[PDB]
Amino acid sequence: NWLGGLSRAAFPKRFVFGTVTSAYQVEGMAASGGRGPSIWDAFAHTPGNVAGNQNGDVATDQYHRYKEDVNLMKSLNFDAYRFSISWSRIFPDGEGRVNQEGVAYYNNLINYLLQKGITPYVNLYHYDLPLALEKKYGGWLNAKMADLFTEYADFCFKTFGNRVKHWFTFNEPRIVALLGYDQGTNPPKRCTKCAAGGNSATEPYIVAHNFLLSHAAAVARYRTKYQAAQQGKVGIVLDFNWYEALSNSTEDQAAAQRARDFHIGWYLDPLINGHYPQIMQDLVKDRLPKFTPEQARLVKGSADYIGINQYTASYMKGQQLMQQTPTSYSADWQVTYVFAKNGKPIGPQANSNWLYIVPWGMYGCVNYIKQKYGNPTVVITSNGMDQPANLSRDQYLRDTTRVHFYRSYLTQLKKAIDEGANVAGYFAWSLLDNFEWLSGYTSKFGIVYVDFNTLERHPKASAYWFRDMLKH
Numbered sequence: 001n002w003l004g005g006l007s008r009a010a011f012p013k014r015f016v017f018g019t020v021t022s023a024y025q026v027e028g029m030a031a032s033g034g035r036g037p038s039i040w041d042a043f044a045h046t047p048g049n050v051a052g053n054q055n056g057d058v059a060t061d062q063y064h065r066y067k068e069d070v071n072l073m074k075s076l077n078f079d080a081y082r083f084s085i086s087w088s089r090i091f092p093d094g095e096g097r098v099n100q101e102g103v104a105y106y107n108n109l110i111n112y113l114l115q116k117g118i119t120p121y122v123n124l125y126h127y128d129l130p131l132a133l134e135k136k137y138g139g140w141l142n143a144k145m146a147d148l149f150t151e152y153a154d155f156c157f158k159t160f161g162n163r164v165k166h167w168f169t170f171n172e173p174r175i176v177a178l179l180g181y182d183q184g185t186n187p188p189k190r191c192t193k194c195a196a197g198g199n200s201a202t203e204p205y206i207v208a209h210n211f212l213l214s215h216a217a218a219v220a221r222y223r224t225k226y227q228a229a230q231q232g233k234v235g236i237v238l239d240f241n242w243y244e245a246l247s248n249s250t251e252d253q254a255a256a257q258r259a260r261d262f263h264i265g266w267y268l269d270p271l272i273n274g275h276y277p278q279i280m281q282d283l284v285k286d287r288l289p290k291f292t293p294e295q296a297r298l299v300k301g302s303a304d305y306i307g308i309n310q311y312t313a314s315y316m317k318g319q320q321l322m323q324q325t326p327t328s329y330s331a332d333w334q335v336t337y338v339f340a341k342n343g344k345p346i347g348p349q350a351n352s353n354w355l356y357i358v359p360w361g362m363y364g365c366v367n368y369i370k371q372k373y374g375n376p377t378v379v380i381t382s383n384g385m386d387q388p389a390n391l392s393r394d395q396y397l398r399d400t401t402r403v404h405f406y407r408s409y410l411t412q413l414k415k416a417i418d419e420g421a422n423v424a425g426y427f428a429w430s431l432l433d434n435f436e437w438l439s440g441y442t443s444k445f446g447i448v449y450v451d452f453n454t455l456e457r458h459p460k461a462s463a464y465w466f467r468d469m470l471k472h
């Protein structure tokens with residue numbers, strides 16, 4: 001049947017299903033309601049940076065329409081909603097003066113969600129550093145971010161935490177490090193070649209270290225000041241795409257494992273075990289910052305659950321490990337990407353070139369975390385695929401590839417859970433077609449279509465699929 005045997009009964013009791021957005025991608029009102037600019041506002045307003053020179057000034061205008069969108073997600077039988085708070089909408093300069101109008105918006109959103117029986121899962125940060133902090137402090141290159149982020153987090157805990165019980169600090173710090181400071185294609189556009197400056201061999205590691213230290217500091221503040229009264233939880237969201245050895249050779253299996261360690265272990269080994277992966281210590285050496293014993297003890301165990309954003313999988317081919325002049329975080333892995341095996345592609349691509357449709361990658365990732373890291377509580381915090389630009393409304397709505405995508409990926413997640421993986425929830429990226437970063441409005445990830453001329457919402461076939469699967 002079109003559900004393929006899936007329903008709430010096929011998952012654990014009290015398993016959480018939700019949808020996901022982020023502030024800059026859906027809110028709009030980017031320069032209104034008292035919001036200060038983020039590094040993404042500056043980046044997107046520069047000609048050439050985003051597809052079609054588009055930006056998030058208006059986006060889906062969820063700022064004005066949030067009750068429509070909450071009504072819709074309730075009608076589709078979701079239990080929860082993952083969204084982010086824009087740091088610069090609360091603190092336009094990232095520190096100092098509070099924008100009360102911004103505070104009121106998130107109060108209103110949170111209160112309506114609760115009124116409608118949808119649990120808020122709230123991210124503090126989703127790529128959108130206040131531009132003032134980038135300019136004044138140098139953003140995530142500066143260890144002072146720990147203090148700056150903790151003060152912002154403290155405000156959010158105090159202001160919203162009597163109602164919000166499920167927090168995340170960051171979203172995919174690996175992607176910030178990779179695209180912001182290795183390749184230099186996302187803000188602040190730093191890299192060895194880059195006009196803005198940078199060093200692709202050192203800066204990604206500095207940035208990741210500062211995310212880990214800031215996460216740990218924010219959680220320490222939660223636990224020492226707020227947790228007794230509020231009784232909520234705080235985690236982090238990490239991307240993890242699967243790596244499969246191209247062959248059973250020792251060198252191909254070692255390559256796939258190196259890729260896992262440089263991708264997810266970079267954050268998970270510190271968060272679970274209190275140190276960076278051994279292979280990273282061995283290869284990156286003095287370019288990898290060292291936690292002091294005290295810092296390592298603050299980072300270890302500092303995530304109450306691990307959010308995983310899972311989309312795709314790649315084959316990995318190995319090589320003899322060589323002594324090499326450092327060039328970049330990416331080159332440090334000493335692996336070779338491969339997208340076919342035995343003459344067959346690993347899967348077909350969605351609209352995004354990096355997004356190969358590989359449902360068994362979901363099982364791969366979840367099983368791996370279960371087996372390697374002592375089966376921590378995991379929440380799938382994003383999973384989904386995109387349609388291309390320029391389709392007709394009805395073409396967007398008949399999204400049979402996305403229906404197949406969710407049925408297959410959820411069957412694979414179910415397989416892992418039935419084998420004992422401690423997965424507590426699953427969140428579809430995205431509730432709505434939205435501003436997809438460098439792709440702007442040319443990539444459509446939503447289970448709900450948004451007409452970007454009229455701003456009208458129309459649920460796609462995949463939205464009705466969820467509604468059917470999730471009925472109580």
Ligand SMILES: [Zn+2]
Nearest residue numbers: 061063064065
């Ligand atoms: Zn509006």
